[PDB]
Curated annotation (Swiss-Prot), chain A:
Role: One of the primary rRNA binding proteins. Required for association of the 30S and 50S subunits to form the 70S ribosome, for tRNA binding and peptide bond formation. It has been suggested to have peptidyltransferase activity; this is somewhat controversial. Makes several contacts with the 16S rRNA in the 70S ribosome.
Keyword rRNA-binding (UniProt): yes
Protein name: Large ribosomal subunit protein uL2
Organism: Pseudomonas aeruginosa (strain ATCC 15692 / DSM 22644 / CIP 104116 / JCM 14847 / LMG 12228 / 1C / PRS 101 / PAO1)
Iron-sulfur is among the record's keywords: no
Quaternary structure annotation from Swiss-Prot or TrEMBL: Part of the 50S ribosomal subunit. Forms a bridge to the 30S subunit in the 70S ribosome.
Matches recorded under Gene3D superfamilies: 2.30.30.30, Nucleic acid-binding proteins, Ribosomal protein L2, domain 3
InterPro entries the record matches: NA-bd_OB-fold, Rib_uL2_dom2, Ribosomal_uL2, Ribosomal_uL2_bac/org-type, Ribosomal_uL2_C, Ribosomal_uL2_CS, Ribosomal_uL2_dom3, Ribosomal_uL2_RNA-bd_dom
Pfam family, one: Ribosomal_L2_C
Swiss-Prot record, chain B:
Family in the record: Belongs to the bacterial ribosomal protein bL34 family.
GO cellular component, one term: ribonucleoprotein complex
Record's protein name: Large ribosomal subunit protein bL34
Keywords, in A-Z order: Ribonucleoprotein, Ribosomal protein
BP GO annotations: translation
InterPro entries for this protein: Ribosomal_bL34, Ribosomal_bL34_CS
Organism phylogeny: Bacteria, Pseudomonadati, Pseudomonadota, Gammaproteobacteria, Pseudomonadales
Gene transcribed to yield this protein: rpmH
HAMAP family registered for this protein in UniProt: Ribosomal_bL34
Native organism: Pseudomonas aeruginosa (strain ATCC 15692 / DSM 22644 / CIP 104116 / JCM 14847 / LMG 12228 / 1C / PRS 101 / PAO1)
The keyword Repressor is assigned to this record: no
Cysteines joined through disulfide linkages: none
PANTHER family assigned to the protein according to its UniProt record, in alphabetical order: LARGE RIBOSOMAL SUBUNIT PROTEIN BL34M (PTHR14503:SF4), MITOCHONDRIAL RIBOSOMAL PROTEIN 34 FAMILY MEMBER (PTHR14503)
Superkingdom in the source lineage: Bacteria
Ranges where the record places region Disordered: 24-44
Keyword presence, Ribosomal protein: yes
Amino acid sequence: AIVKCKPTSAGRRFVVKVVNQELHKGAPYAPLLEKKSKSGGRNNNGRITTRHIGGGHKQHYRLVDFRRNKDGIPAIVERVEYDPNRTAHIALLKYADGERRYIIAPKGVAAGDQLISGIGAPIKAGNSMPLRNIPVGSTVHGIELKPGKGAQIARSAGASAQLVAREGAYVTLRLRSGEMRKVLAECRATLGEVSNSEHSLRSLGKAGATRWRGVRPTVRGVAMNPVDHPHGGGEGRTSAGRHPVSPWGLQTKGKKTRSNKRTDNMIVRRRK
Amino acid sequence: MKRTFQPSTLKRARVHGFRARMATKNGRQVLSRRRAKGRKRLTV
RNA sequence: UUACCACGGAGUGAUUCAUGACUGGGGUGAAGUCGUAACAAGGUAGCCGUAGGGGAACCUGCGGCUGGAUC
RNA sequence: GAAAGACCAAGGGUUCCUGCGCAACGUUAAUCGACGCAGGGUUAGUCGGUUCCUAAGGCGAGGCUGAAAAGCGUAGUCGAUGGGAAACAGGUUAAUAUUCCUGUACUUCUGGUUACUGCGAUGGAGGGACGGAGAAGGCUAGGCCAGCUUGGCGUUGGUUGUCCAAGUUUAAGGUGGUAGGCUGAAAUCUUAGGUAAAUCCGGGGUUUCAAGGCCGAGAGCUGAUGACGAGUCGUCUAGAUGACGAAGUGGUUGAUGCCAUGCUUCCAAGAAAAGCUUCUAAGCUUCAGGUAACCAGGAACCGUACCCCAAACCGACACAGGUGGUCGGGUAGAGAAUACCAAGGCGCUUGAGAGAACUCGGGUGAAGGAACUAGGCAAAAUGGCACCGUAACUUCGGGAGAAGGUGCGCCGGCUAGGGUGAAGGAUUUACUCCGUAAGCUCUGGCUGGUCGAAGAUACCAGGCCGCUGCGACUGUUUAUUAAAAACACAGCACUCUGCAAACACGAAAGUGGACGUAUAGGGUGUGACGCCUGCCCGGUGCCGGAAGGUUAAUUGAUGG
RNA sequence: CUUGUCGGGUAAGUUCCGACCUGCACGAAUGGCGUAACGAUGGCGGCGCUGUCUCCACCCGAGACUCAGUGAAAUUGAAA
RNA sequence: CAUGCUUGAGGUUCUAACUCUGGUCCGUAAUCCGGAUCGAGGACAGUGUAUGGUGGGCAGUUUGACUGGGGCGGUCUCCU
Ligand SMILES: [Mg+2]
Ligand SMILES: [Mg+2]
Ligand SMILES: [Mg+2]
Ligand SMILES: [Mg+2]
Ligand SMILES: [Mg+2]
Ligand SMILES: [Mg+2]
Ligand SMILES: [Mg+2]
Ligand SMILES: [Mg+2]
Ligand SMILES: [Mg+2]
Ligand SMILES: [Mg+2]
Ligand SMILES: [Mg+2]
Ligand SMILES: [Mg+2]
Ligand SMILES: [Mg+2]
Ligand SMILES: [Mg+2]
Ligand SMILES: [Mg+2]
Ligand SMILES: [Mg+2]
Ligand SMILES: [Mg+2]
Ligand SMILES: [Mg+2]
Ligand SMILES: [Mg+2]
Ligand SMILES: [Mg+2]
Ligand SMILES: [Mg+2]
Ligand SMILES: [Mg+2]
Ligand SMILES: [Mg+2]
Ligand SMILES: [Mg+2]
Ligand SMILES: [Mg+2]
Ligand SMILES: [Mg+2]
Ligand SMILES: [Mg+2]
Ligand SMILES: [Mg+2]
Ligand SMILES: [Mg+2]
Ligand SMILES: [Mg+2]
Ligand SMILES: [Mg+2]
Ligand SMILES: [Mg+2]
Ligand SMILES: [Mg+2]
Ligand SMILES: [Mg+2]
Ligand SMILES: [Mg+2]
Ligand SMILES: [Mg+2]
Ligand SMILES: [Mg+2]
Ligand SMILES: [Mg+2]
Ligand SMILES: [Mg+2]
Ligand SMILES: [Mg+2]
Ligand SMILES: [Mg+2]
Ligand SMILES: [Mg+2]
Ligand SMILES: [Mg+2]
Ligand SMILES: [Mg+2]
Ligand SMILES: [Mg+2]
Ligand SMILES: [Mg+2]
Ligand SMILES: [Mg+2]
Ligand SMILES: [Mg+2]
Ligand SMILES: [Mg+2]
Ligand SMILES: [Mg+2]
Ligand SMILES: [Mg+2]
Ligand SMILES: [Mg+2]
Ligand SMILES: [Mg+2]
Ligand SMILES: [Mg+2]
Ligand SMILES: [Mg+2]
Ligand SMILES: [Mg+2]
Ligand SMILES: [Mg+2]
Ligand SMILES: [Mg+2]
Ligand SMILES: [Mg+2]
Ligand SMILES: [Mg+2]
Ligand SMILES: [Mg+2]
Ligand SMILES: [Mg+2]
Ligand SMILES: [Mg+2]
Ligand SMILES: [Mg+2]
Ligand SMILES: [Mg+2]
Ligand SMILES: [Mg+2]
Ligand SMILES: [Mg+2]
Ligand SMILES: [Mg+2]
Ligand SMILES: [Mg+2]
Ligand SMILES: [Mg+2]
Ligand SMILES: [Mg+2]
Ligand SMILES: [Mg+2]
Ligand SMILES: [Mg+2]
Ligand SMILES: [Mg+2]
Ligand SMILES: [Mg+2]
Ligand SMILES: [Mg+2]
Ligand SMILES: [Mg+2]
Ligand SMILES: [Mg+2]
Ligand SMILES: [Mg+2]
Ligand SMILES: [Mg+2]
Ligand SMILES: [Mg+2]
Ligand SMILES: [Mg+2]
Ligand SMILES: [Mg+2]
Ligand SMILES: [Mg+2]
Ligand SMILES: [Mg+2]
Ligand SMILES: [Mg+2]
Ligand SMILES: [Mg+2]
Ligand SMILES: [Mg+2]
Ligand SMILES: [Mg+2]
Ligand SMILES: [Mg+2]
Ligand SMILES: [Mg+2]
Ligand SMILES: [Mg+2]
Ligand SMILES: [Mg+2]
Ligand SMILES: [Mg+2]
Ligand SMILES: [Mg+2]
Ligand SMILES: [Mg+2]
Ligand SMILES: [Mg+2]
Ligand SMILES: [Mg+2]
Ligand SMILES: [Mg+2]
Ligand SMILES: [Mg+2]
Ligand SMILES: [Mg+2]
Ligand SMILES: [Mg+2]
Ligand SMILES: [Mg+2]
Ligand SMILES: [Mg+2]
Ligand SMILES: [Mg+2]
Ligand SMILES: [Mg+2]
Ligand SMILES: [Mg+2]
Ligand SMILES: [Mg+2]
Ligand SMILES: [Mg+2]
Ligand SMILES: [Mg+2]
Ligand SMILES: [Mg+2]
Ligand SMILES: [Mg+2]
Ligand SMILES: [Mg+2]
Ligand SMILES: [Mg+2]
Ligand SMILES: [Mg+2]
Ligand SMILES: [Mg+2]
Ligand SMILES: [Mg+2]
Ligand SMILES: [Mg+2]
Ligand SMILES: [Mg+2]
Ligand SMILES: [Mg+2]
Ligand SMILES: [Mg+2]
Ligand SMILES: [Mg+2]
Ligand SMILES: [Mg+2]
Ligand SMILES: [Mg+2]
Ligand SMILES: [Mg+2]
Ligand SMILES: [Mg+2]
Ligand SMILES: [Mg+2]
Ligand SMILES: [Mg+2]
Ligand SMILES: [Mg+2]
Ligand SMILES: [Mg+2]
Ligand SMILES: [Mg+2]
Ligand SMILES: [Mg+2]
Ligand SMILES: [Mg+2]
Ligand SMILES: [Mg+2]
Ligand SMILES: [Mg+2]
Ligand SMILES: [Mg+2]
Ligand SMILES: [Mg+2]
Ligand SMILES: [Mg+2]
Ligand SMILES: [Mg+2]
Ligand SMILES: [Mg+2]
Ligand SMILES: [Mg+2]
Ligand SMILES: [Mg+2]
Ligand SMILES: [Mg+2]
Ligand SMILES: [Mg+2]
Ligand SMILES: [Mg+2]
Ligand SMILES: [Mg+2]
Ligand SMILES: [Mg+2]
Ligand SMILES: [Mg+2]
Ligand SMILES: [Mg+2]
Ligand SMILES: [Mg+2]
Ligand SMILES: [Mg+2]
Ligand SMILES: [Mg+2]
Ligand SMILES: [Mg+2]
Ligand SMILES: [Mg+2]
Ligand SMILES: [Mg+2]
Ligand SMILES: [Mg+2]
Ligand SMILES: [Mg+2]
Ligand SMILES: [Mg+2]
Ligand SMILES: [Mg+2]
C-alpha cells in the first residue's frame, strides 16, 4: 500500500512511500546477476551527452527474459522481487526442468500460477502467445515489435495496451499514449497489465531523495548569462525575452520533432 | 595553504614519460625537437 | 535561635469593564435617482436547498414541493 | 603530553654514524650543526614489492570508418586504491634488524623409494562474494586494588607501622571445539535443464531417521625446569666485563579492539576475476597421471640507512601555512572536551638593561547605565545536573532548554537494592547447571552536624523576550573585498518522443539516452503547504487545412 | 510630490507598527494573497549587562628608548 | 471512335536492387566484423550532386561630422 510519514522532521513531512509486504526480502538469484557501472551521462568521447545524471546507489543488473521462448513447458512463480533497474516488479519462474528465469511480473501473480507460453496456452494473465491467437478486445503488455527480439512496448509499472482490430498479416492495437499502431501478428505479447501500478502515487519528499536515484540538479536557463543559454541575460529577474527554446536553440513549446519517414506506414494515427 | 605542485612519481611518468611521448606522433615531434636543440634531459 | 505568618516584592497567565484611527452590516426617516422582482397564468408559475454570474431588485443550472391558473 | 610523544604511506635522497675542521652557510658568536673534508653504515622462504587475478580506464592482430595524419572497437593483454601461501619472543652495534644470533614455529615446491589407483580443460557447477543503521551479549588488551619480594627508618613536630619506594613480565605456535551463529539428514528409482558430456549442479517420485554437518572469538593446558628480572659478587679501567640472581600470585573494572563478512531491520537494494573443491570432452590404458607414507634438498630478484604533521615533503627561506592512515596511560570528567601530570620530548639560533609619550594583548574601577554610534560595533553578561513550572500560534510534530524558580561542599547515624563470587546441592560426570560467607565493585532513601562572603567555587560551560519584510525548510555560490532576498529543492504545469525514440558528442563509423520503453526519457517555466489563478488569438511564434494566387533548379514553343 | 494624512509607541520618532486610497509607475505559475517551523538574512522596540559613553585613572606583559652584534626598503636633476 | 507504338502525373501490387542497431549456422574459443540462410520492409528509405525555404546555432563587419566638454536637439547643397 501507500504509507504517509509523520512530520517528525522538516524533510519527512511530504514523504509518501510505496511499501509492498509481498516482496521477497532475501538475496536475489545470483546466477542471473551481472555488474553494471555508472556512466555519469558521458559517452566514449568523454563528453556529457545527457545532462542531470550522476551519483546514486550501486546496482546489479538482473537478466530479465524478454523473449519468453520456452514454449510448452509449465512454470511456477517462486517469488516476486524488487528490481533497481525497473519501476516494475520481477518474478522468478521455475520451469518443469530447473531453468529458473526472471520475467516482468504481471498484476495478480503471487506464489503459484502456471504461466505457460506458446500456441495453445490458456487466456489467463501472465501467459504469452503470438498476437494471432489472442482474442480481440483484450489487454496485453510486453509487446514484441520484430519477431525474435523480445518485448519493447508496455513494460513499465502499470502499463498495458488494447488489442482493437485484426486484419491480414498485421494487427492494430491502441498504445498507452493514445496512439494507434499496427504490429506484425507473428510477434508475441503477454496478457494483463504490469504490476506495481500504485508506483505513481509516491512523493519523494526531499531533495536528497532525488540524489539517491542518480539525478543531478536542473538549473533553468533564465538564471544563466547570455553566453550560456539563449534565455540568459537581463537586469533583474527577466522572462526569456524570446520564444522559449532549448539550450541548443530548438523551440520547446509545441514544435514537433519526429522525422522518421521509414516507419510511417506503421502509424495508423498519432497520439493527438 | 595547498599549492599547485603535489608530487607523485607514478603520475609524472604516465603523463610526461618517455613511453608516453613515444605513443603519439605529436609526442615524437617533441622528442626530435629536443634532440635537435641538444637537451641533456630529453624527458622527465 | 527555629517554626508559623500579615504587609510588601519578582515573573508569567486567565477573566472582566471602559476606550480606540479605521471598517461591516441593521433600523428609523421626506413629494430624491434607477429599474419593475412579487401579488391575476403579475405577463418566463412561484417557493425550498446548493453553485456560478450580475448596478440592484435578481438571472441561470441541478434536485424537490404545490402553499400553481387553463384544461 | 589525542602532542610539541611514537609508527606506517607519499615525497626527498645520504640529510644517518664516527674522526678532523670553521672561510662561506646558520638573520648574533660558535669550540656547535641537517655546513666542509674523509671513512663507515642498510643482511629476509614468512615484512613490502615482483610473480597470480581482476575494477574504472588504456592499448588494441584482424575489422569498420575517415583528404592524409588518424578515430572507434573484437579476440586479446595491461592497469590497485581491492582479491589471493606462511613468524614470533629475547640478545646485540657508534650507526641494521619480525632480516644477524639464540629458542621455538609455519607455508610451499623439487627429486627419490614404497603401497594403492581412472588421469585429463579454455568448458559445466559450487565457492570466493561484500549495503546503511541499530541493539543485546561474550571476550581480550589495558587500568586499579590486595598480597608478595628487595630496600628504607628521613636536616623540622611524628613515623618498626592499617608506614615509604620499586618490581611483581613472558609471544607466535600446538592442543582444546567453548559463549555463540547457520543448516534437516540418509538410502534408492529417474530426468523437455546447466550450448557437447557428466557419477557434479538443478528438477521429480518413494522409504527411513529426529539426528548429523559446517563455522566460531576466548578460557584452561603447553610452549616455558627456559628467557626476563631489582641487585650481589669476581676481573679489567667515574666506567666496562663474566658469573649468579629475589618475588614473579589473587580480586575487581573494562574498550571505539575481536566473535562480527554474525543477528535484527530499512530502502536508495548493495564489485569483478583468479587461487580453491568437484564433473566430464577430446586423449591415454598397463610409460602417462593421481592419492598416501618415509628420505633428501630448496625457496630466486628488488626495497630496507635517515626525515616523515616536519628545519629533510609542498610553499624562492632553518617560512606562525598545508599534508592520508595507526597507537594513544593517571587523577578529575559524559567524553578523543578541559586542567594538572606519566612514558617520551622540548625552552621555539640575537642578547643586556631602563621602566617616557604612543601602539598592541590583558586586569580592576567611584557615581551614572546606551546619554555612544550609521548601528549596543566591541565588551560585559548567561552558561551543569536533578526537580517544579511554562504563553500566543500551529501543518498537531512543534513552539520549548519558551519564560521563571528551588537544591548542590565536607563529616557522621540509620537503611534499601544490583554484579562478581568459597562452601554446598543436582546429573548430562565436567570448557555443566543451581547457588554462594567474606572480599571487591556499582546504584539509591531520610536524618543530623559543621566551615567560609561565596560549595555547578578553578578550566569548561545557551543571554532572553515583543512586533514586522524576504525565502517554506536541510543544502549551494563570486579560490583572493559581496553567503544573500541570489542558485538548488520536494511539489506543480506545458510541450516533445512508439524505439534504429526525441535529444547530444562525433566529416563518419559509432557512443550516451538505456542493456531503459509513455507510471519512461528530453526541454521549458514556476517553486513546501492553504485559498486561488480573471479578460484578450488583433501582433509574433507553434499546430491543422488544402481549394485558389505567387513561386527554384529543369525543359525548350515562339520570335529576333 | 513626501518627513502624504490619521492613530500607537518616546520628553521629543524623516526609521517602526496599524490604517486610509490620490496605485507618478501592484496584480494573479517572469504566479497573487496568507502561512506553523527554520535563518552567522533586513527593519523597529524592551529586560538584564556593562569603560560604548560623561571622562578617563591605575596596574601587568610585548614593542617603542639606551648598550653590544648583524644589517634592509621605497625614493633621489643638483642644493649653502 | 477503335487499336497500335510512345509519353506527364496518380493508385495498387510483386521481387530481384537496396536496408535491417531481427533469428541460427560457419570463420571462432568472439553481443565486433564478414559469408550463408530464414524473416521483415521495398523501389520506398537512404547517400552523392543540383536547387527553393528556414536558420544570431555560429562568423566577419558596419553603426558620420560640426558642437563654448560629450549626449539630446539642430545643421550639412544652392540663391537674396
Ligand atoms: Mg526523509
Ligand atoms: Mg558473479
Ligand atoms: Mg533533466
Ligand atoms: Mg536507473
Ligand atoms: Mg523517498
Ligand atoms: Mg526541476
Ligand atoms: Mg529549465
Ligand atoms: Mg528547474
Ligand atoms: Mg540570478
Ligand atoms: Mg546571473
Ligand atoms: Mg560551455
Ligand atoms: Mg545567444
Ligand atoms: Mg540584477
Ligand atoms: Mg525590471
Ligand atoms: Mg536576470
Ligand atoms: Mg604548478
Ligand atoms: Mg628524434
Ligand atoms: Mg522575564
Ligand atoms: Mg504576564
Ligand atoms: Mg496579574
Ligand atoms: Mg479591546
Ligand atoms: Mg471605536
Ligand atoms: Mg472617529
Ligand atoms: Mg420571477
Ligand atoms: Mg413583474
Ligand atoms: Mg413571474
Ligand atoms: Mg417580461
Ligand atoms: Mg404565480
Ligand atoms: Mg439556510
Ligand atoms: Mg435556484
Ligand atoms: Mg453552478
Ligand atoms: Mg451565490
Ligand atoms: Mg445568466
Ligand atoms: Mg450545473
Ligand atoms: Mg425542478
Ligand atoms: Mg587536549
Ligand atoms: Mg613535545
Ligand atoms: Mg611528533
Ligand atoms: Mg621514497
Ligand atoms: Mg628536496
Ligand atoms: Mg653524514
Ligand atoms: Mg648528524
Ligand atoms: Mg668535532
Ligand atoms: Mg672567529
Ligand atoms: Mg651565515
Ligand atoms: Mg655567523
Ligand atoms: Mg632566524
Ligand atoms: Mg657532514
Ligand atoms: Mg579492457
Ligand atoms: Mg582503441
Ligand atoms: Mg590495424
Ligand atoms: Mg594483467
Ligand atoms: Mg594493493
Ligand atoms: Mg589487494
Ligand atoms: Mg589482499
Ligand atoms: Mg635507527
Ligand atoms: Mg632466526
Ligand atoms: Mg567458475
Ligand atoms: Mg571487496
Ligand atoms: Mg544487513
Ligand atoms: Mg553494515
Ligand atoms: Mg586485570
Ligand atoms: Mg622489609
Ligand atoms: Mg621528618
Ligand atoms: Mg624528627
Ligand atoms: Mg601462559
Ligand atoms: Mg593460541
Ligand atoms: Mg554451542
Ligand atoms: Mg632496515
Ligand atoms: Mg628503519
Ligand atoms: Mg615521523
Ligand atoms: Mg629558526
Ligand atoms: Mg613549517
Ligand atoms: Mg586535512
Ligand atoms: Mg586521557
Ligand atoms: Mg566539546
Ligand atoms: Mg595546556
Ligand atoms: Mg610538566
Ligand atoms: Mg618526564
Ligand atoms: Mg627566535
Ligand atoms: Mg590597551
Ligand atoms: Mg585589548
Ligand atoms: Mg582589556
Ligand atoms: Mg573587565
Ligand atoms: Mg583590586
Ligand atoms: Mg563603573
Ligand atoms: Mg559599582
Ligand atoms: Mg539598569
Ligand atoms: Mg542615541
Ligand atoms: Mg549623539
Ligand atoms: Mg561610528
Ligand atoms: Mg555584540
Ligand atoms: Mg562594555
Ligand atoms: Mg571577549
Ligand atoms: Mg567575553
Ligand atoms: Mg516564539
Ligand atoms: Mg531553564
Ligand atoms: Mg555563617
Ligand atoms: Mg533565559
Ligand atoms: Mg524574556
Ligand atoms: Mg503585513
Ligand atoms: Mg518593509
Ligand atoms: Mg534564498
Ligand atoms: Mg533559504
Ligand atoms: Mg514566500
Ligand atoms: Mg511558503
Ligand atoms: Mg509564497
Ligand atoms: Mg545538515
Ligand atoms: Mg541544523
Ligand atoms: Mg570573495
Ligand atoms: Mg562572498
Ligand atoms: Mg551563510
Ligand atoms: Mg565573505
Ligand atoms: Mg548563486
Ligand atoms: Mg537525451
Ligand atoms: Mg514526462
Ligand atoms: Mg530540463
Ligand atoms: Mg523564481
Ligand atoms: Mg523561488
Ligand atoms: Mg528557485
Ligand atoms: Mg515566489
Ligand atoms: Mg495568433
Ligand atoms: Mg487566428
Ligand atoms: Mg501548415
Ligand atoms: Mg519616499
Ligand atoms: Mg511616512
Ligand atoms: Mg504619525
Ligand atoms: Mg534609533
Ligand atoms: Mg520605532
Ligand atoms: Mg505601513
Ligand atoms: Mg498615492
Ligand atoms: Mg510587483
Ligand atoms: Mg494567466
Ligand atoms: Mg511583475
Ligand atoms: Mg505577501
Ligand atoms: Mg542554512
Ligand atoms: Mg540559505
Ligand atoms: Mg525575521
Ligand atoms: Mg531608540
Ligand atoms: Mg591611563
Ligand atoms: Mg608597560
Ligand atoms: Mg652597537
Ligand atoms: Mg644597535
Ligand atoms: Mg544508439
Ligand atoms: Mg528512394
Ligand atoms: Mg530524397
Ligand atoms: Mg541531398
Ligand atoms: Mg549574436
Ligand atoms: Mg553568433
Ligand atoms: Mg555576431
Ligand atoms: Mg579584419
Ligand atoms: Mg568594429
Ligand atoms: Mg559604413
Ligand atoms: Mg564628435
Ligand atoms: Mg552640448
Ligand atoms: Mg570655444
Ligand atoms: Mg564652457
Ligand atoms: Mg567658440
Ligand atoms: Mg570647455
